[PDB]
Each structure stands twice: as structure tokens, then as C-alpha cells.
Amino acid sequence: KPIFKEVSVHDPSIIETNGTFYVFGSHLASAKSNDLMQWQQLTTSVSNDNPLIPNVYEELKETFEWAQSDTLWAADVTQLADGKYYMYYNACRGDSPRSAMGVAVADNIEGPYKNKGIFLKSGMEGTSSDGTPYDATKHPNVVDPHTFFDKDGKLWMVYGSYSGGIFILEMNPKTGFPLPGQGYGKKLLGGNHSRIEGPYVLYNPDTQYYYLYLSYGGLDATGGYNIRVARSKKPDGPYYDAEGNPMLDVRGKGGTFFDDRSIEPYGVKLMGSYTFETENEKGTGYVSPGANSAYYDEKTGRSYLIFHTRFPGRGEEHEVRVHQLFMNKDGWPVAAPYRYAGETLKEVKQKDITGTYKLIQHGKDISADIKQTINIQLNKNHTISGEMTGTWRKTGKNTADITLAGKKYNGVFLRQWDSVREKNVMTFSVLNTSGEAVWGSKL
Ligand SMILES: [Ca+2]
Ligand SMILES: [Cl-]
């Protein structure tokens, strides 16, 4: 009975305004929804026909000319105190960080957005935005913005993709431009063309941390894209993962490019490629989920992960997905194993927990391998047996305390909807200190 209507917005950046959710992504694509389940596609590509920015090729001509492109990369739109909508647009040549980032402003979320000008460039041949010669091994690619207010109401923008890593700038709350004299801003992590991009920051008032979401790996079907997270007491860091690793340390080895091995150990990994599908039964399954945004609902205290994903056997086809997020006992989020369908955390009974589960282990790697299931059973006597062993306990209403092969995980038990099989399912989603995520789906 749950109804979904799909849309395709690459790198979706969530914004809620007055009861409606919008995503703005790359290629000036966008979509909206009232329930996070049925989306309506609004725009799909950059052309003089796109209503978000009429005559876009003229309006943003300096950007297309600098970046030597005919499209835009991953936008973010943020409403400021003046009530207006500020689109942080960016373009990149694609084979190098020859990029420009600017801001455009609209009275209405659906446009039209009016260019205010470019404020960052990368890929120049000479002096960069920080007054030193541009060097992609240490300077950012000026793409993948997220402009956000911290808990004090101060305005920031985090951004970056590959190249020199991820940076954050203090922003002017009145004009939407960075405050003067920062260059590229403060470095949060990265370097030497690490495969890390799409940063997104979400504060959680309950835990009192800022969560910096990141995409590791390549976006493509063979790229190993996965969603990771780290946290800090402050919006500008320092950020750390669940083991206490400083994210600032994360980078490829000097003199290398796309060094996945050096970066794999760092960050909490929330989701990578997987399938619950098995020879005997259908199941949900994603390839290269990533480029996420996140939403915190102040009225309910619920959080959501918003992202695009590809799918097993669908090549480079992508759609927007939304998965609810839950904070574990250690203040780290775990993702619901199934897409959001109106589910809420509820009281769970033990009798509804025991039984056989398909288990997915997202691990800690960057891998194009589609993670597959193994079968375990949660027994009445609180042991786990089958293809792995350990123990399970429930704490409070729905807290999952699970030991598997000598590692301790914490998360939640949750009944939700499997949209492929069209059935309710008991589920668990838990995380260990190594930042390794485990999902269970019953039966
Ligand atoms: Ca983004
Ligand atoms: Cl799905």
C-alpha cells in the first residue's frame, strides 16, 4: 500500500520550506515531495528551457566559460534570514578541477534564480583564491557546496570534491557570499586527489554534535561509492570518526591519485552497495549509494538521509532515495535498511525479534562488490547462531545491543516496509566502534 513515485536528481540536496521538501542536484535538476515518498520531477537538465534559471547560458555565462562545460554540478539551495533562497551553483570541466562556484538568489523556491556572481574558482594557472599558486593536491575543487546555519545561527559553507580535499568557509548571512579574507577556508580533511566528495553537515541537538557526511569512492557502478560520516562539537571541526581518528589526517599518499587504500580506514561507513536479493527471493538492493544530504525534523526529532543511488543490474540509472536515520547509544547514526515509508521507532517485543535474519555487512572498504547476505538466527536464549555467532539484547523500547563474531554493535530494532516484496519486516541496524554498519532483515 505504501506508494512511491521515483525521480532522478543526481547529488540531491534536501531543503524543506513550509511543508514541502525539495531536492536540488546536478544539471540544474530538481524534484519535490510532501511525504518524502512520492516525488515530482520538476527539472532535469541545463538548458535555456529550465525555469529555475531562465536563459541560464547567458545568466551564468562566466561560469560556463571558466569551467568549459555546458552543465552544472551539485547545487545546494539554502534559505537565509531575508526569506530568500540562495542557490550555490558550480560547474567543473570534468577532467580537472577547472571550476567556478557562485550564488544566485530567488524570491520563490522554484525560481527564477538571479545570478549574484562567482565567488570561488579552481584550476587557474596562476594565483589561487588563497593567494598561493593553485595546486590541486592541496587546494579544493570548488564544487559540492553545502551552505548551512550552525546551532548559534552562524552561516557556513562546506564544499569540495577530490583534489585537495574538503574545506569550510564562514559566510555572510546578509549577502550569501563568504566573509572576506579566507581564501579557500579551513581544511577539514583530504589531499592528494582522495576519492572523497559531497560533504554535508547536519547538527543533532539531542547528541550535541555536528555530523559531517561524505561520499567515498567513485559515483559510477564500479566506483565503490559509499556514504560515510564523522562528527565534531564545532561546525568547523576538528572532525573525528568512531575510533577517534582525526579526519584531518585523511589523505592519499603524496605523489599518488585516487589512493583508496589510505583513506578506507577513516570515517564511519553507513551504507555501500548491497542486495538482500537471493536465488530464492527478491530483495531491495543498491549500487554506489551516495552524494547525500540529510534532514533533521525539529518537530519530531527524526532524521533522514537523502541520496541518489544506482541499482544492481541497472547500469548507471539512478534515483533519489530517503532512509530514516537513528542515533545509537554512542551518538552515531544508523540508517534504516529499507527506504522511508512512514515507519517510526516503536516499542518492540522480544517475541517479534527472535527468528531468522538475512544479514548485510557494509564493512569498512571502498569496493564495487555488491555485499550479499548471510543467514543468522536470533534465538530465544539471546544467542545468535547460523552463518555467524554472537548475542543479542534489547534495551529499553527498541535499542539493539548486538554482538557478532566478537564485535559489539549498537543501534535499533525497527519494523518497516520492504517495497520490493511488499511486506512488513522486522529489522535491525547497528554500528560498532570501528564504524562498521550491520543490517538485519527478518526471515
Ligand atoms: Ca551535495
Ligand atoms: Cl528500494
Q: Which is nearest to 333 in space by CA: 415, 210, 247, 179?
A: 210
- Please give the distance, rounded to the nearest whole angstrom, from the Cα atom of residue 283 to the centre of ligand 2: 9
- Please give the distance, rounded to the nearest whole angstrom, from the Cα atom of residue 72 to the centre of ligand 2: 27
Strands 374-378, 186-189: pairing is unpaired
What are the chain's domains?
12-336 (2.115.10.20), 349-443 (2.40.128.10)
The three three-digit cell numbers of residue 271, written as one number: 551504507
- Please give the distance, rounded to the nearest whole angstrom, from the Cα atom of residue 328 to the centre of ligand 2: 24
CA–CA distance, 348 with 55 (Å, rounded to integer): 54
- Please give the distance, rounded to the nearest whole angstrom, from the Cα atom of residue 277 to the centre of ligand 1: 29
Question: Which ligand gives the minimal distance to the CA of 148?
Answer: 1
**Pairs from 58-64 (Cβ < 8 Å, separation ≥ 24):** 59/104, 59/114, 59/115, 60/89, 60/91, 60/102, 60/104, 60/115, 62/100, 62/102, 62/117, 62/118, 63/89, 63/90, 63/91, 63/100, 63/102, 63/118, 64/91
Residues whose CB falls within 8 Å of the CB of residue 180, separated by 6 or more in sequence, listed in order: none
Question: Which ligand gives the minimal distance to the CA of 26?
Answer: 1
Q: Which residue has the cell 536540488?
A: 24
- Please give the distance, rounded to the nearest whole angstrom, from the Cα atom of residue 408 to the centre of ligand 1: 32
Question: Which ligand gives the minimal distance to the CA of 339?
Answer: 2
Choose, from 11, 170, 241, 401, the residue flagged as catalytic.
Answer: 11
- Please give the distance, rounded to the nearest whole angstrom, from the Cα atom of residue 271 to the centre of ligand 1: 17
Looking at the chain, the number of H-run helices and the number of E-run strands are 3, 29
Choose, from 76, 170, 197, 277, the residue flagged as catalytic.
Answer: 197
Question: Which ligand gives the minimal distance to the CA of 282?
Answer: 2
The DSSP output letter for 61 is H
**HSE, side-chain direction, 13 A CA sphere, residue 76:** 25
3-class DSSP string for 199-231: EEEEEECCCCEEEEEEEECECCCCCECEEEEEE
Per DSSP, the residues of 254-303 read TT-SS-HHHHTTSSEEEE-SEE---SSS---EEEEEEEEEEEE-TTT--E
Helix (H) or strand (E) holding 63: helix 61-67
- Please give the distance, rounded to the nearest whole angstrom, from the Cα atom of residue 143 to the centre of ligand 1: 9
- Please give the distance, rounded to the nearest whole angstrom, from the Cα atom of residue 231 to the centre of ligand 2: 28
- Please give the distance, rounded to the nearest whole angstrom, from the Cα atom of residue 122 to the centre of ligand 1: 18
Question: Which ligand gives the minimal distance to the CA of 287?
Answer: 2
Residue pair 196/166 in contact by the 8 Å Cβ criterion: yes
CA–CA distance, 359 with 246 (Å, rounded to integer): 30
Question: Which ligand gives the minimal distance to the CA of 420?
Answer: 2
- Please give the distance, rounded to the nearest whole angstrom, from the Cα atom of residue 295 to the centre of ligand 1: 13
CA–CA distance, 358 with 395 (Å, rounded to integer): 22
CA–CA distance, 3 with 39 (Å, rounded to integer): 10
- Please give the distance, rounded to the nearest whole angstrom, from the Cα atom of residue 439 to the centre of ligand 2: 15
Biggest alpha carbon–alpha carbon distance for the chain: 69
- Please give the distance, rounded to the nearest whole angstrom, from the Cα atom of residue 279 to the centre of ligand 1: 36
User: Active-site residue 197, yes or no?
Assistant: yes
Question: Which ligand gives the minimal distance to the CA of 10?
Answer: 1
